[PDB]
Design a protein around this ligand. Structure first.
Ligand SMILES: CN(C)c1nnc(CS(N)(=O)=O)s1
Ligand SMILES: [Zn+2]
Length: 257
């Protein structure tokens, strides 16, 4: 099935998922000189105080930290969003070397990694119904650069040993996603898609301008994860990022002047 290797990677996805060549695909290059400040944007409200993490799963592509979304506990609202969007999970994309790993790029600049916090529109009742709607999802994207350690990430880093291979999960309750955010909520926004198959075009993308810094040893531990399942030959989980896709006359708006 789909992956990130020569034979099952981004160049192959369109065959099972035709939308791969659609009109609102993600990620994209953010050309800072073409993006326009949008005064009609409301302030962004990230409300992760009551967040109820459940567990962490190696899904054979990345790792997912999952949340209880049966109530309005951790929500994204404001900005380009109408209504309330519930946090369902987060995951990362990263590279084999520090000069690559992010999905979105900024004036062609690739970061070492990128964090995605995934939310669904509560008017649709559940995630599965939301992914049938043009405004069903919102994903908050955050760039990672190598420098000082990120304290709020270490609990995640700590547990990676326990989920080395595809299909492994560990209890991951009481994790606070507020520790993964940069200081500024300045962002670019555009309408886009999931960056993995099924590549559904139901996402409002909100990409933060300010990267977080993570340590060399923190990213190294990401790169020790496996794509393969237990007892299979070792394929290091690295370079699990889709490259930038055609903007196609979409408008990237900036929240900042
Ligand atoms: C079912 N969910 C929560 C997801 N499906 N594909 C995902 C990857 S991405 N890059 O957030 O679109 S996240
Ligand atoms: Zn993602």
């Amino acid at each position: 099935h789909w992956g990130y290797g020569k034979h099952n990677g981004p160049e192959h996805w369109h065959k099972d998922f035709p939308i791969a060549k659609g009109e609102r695909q993600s990620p994209v290059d953010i050309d800072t000189h073409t993006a326009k400040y949008d005064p009609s944007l409301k302030p962004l409200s990230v409300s992760y105080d009551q967040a109820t993490s459940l567990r962490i799963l190696n899904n054979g592509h990345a790792f997912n930290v999952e949340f209880d979304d049966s109530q309005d506990k951790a929500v994204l609202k404001g900005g380009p969003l109408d209504g309330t969007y519930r946090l369902i999970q987060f995951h990362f994309h990263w590279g084999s070397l520090d000069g690559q790993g992010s999905e979105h790029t900024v004036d062609k600049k690739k970061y070492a990694a990128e964090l995605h916090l995934v939310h669904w529109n509560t008017k649709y009742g559940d995630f599965g119904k939301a992914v049938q709607q043009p405004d069903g999802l919102a994903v908050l994207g955050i760039f990672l650069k190598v420098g000082s350690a990120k304290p709020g990430l270490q609990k995640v880093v700590d547990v990676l040993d326990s989920i080395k291979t595809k299909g492994k999960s560990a209890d991951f309750t009481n994790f606070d996603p507020r520790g993964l955010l940069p200081e500024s909520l300045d962002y670019w926004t555009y309408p886009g898609s999931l960056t993995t198959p099924p590549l559904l075009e139901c996402v409002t993308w909100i990409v933060l301008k300010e990267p977080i810094s993570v340590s060399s040893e923190q990213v190294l531990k990401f790169r020790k994860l496996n794509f393969n399942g237990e007892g299979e030959p070792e394929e290091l989980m690295v370079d699990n990022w889709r490259p930038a896709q055609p903007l196609k006359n979409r408008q990237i708006k900036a929240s900042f002047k």
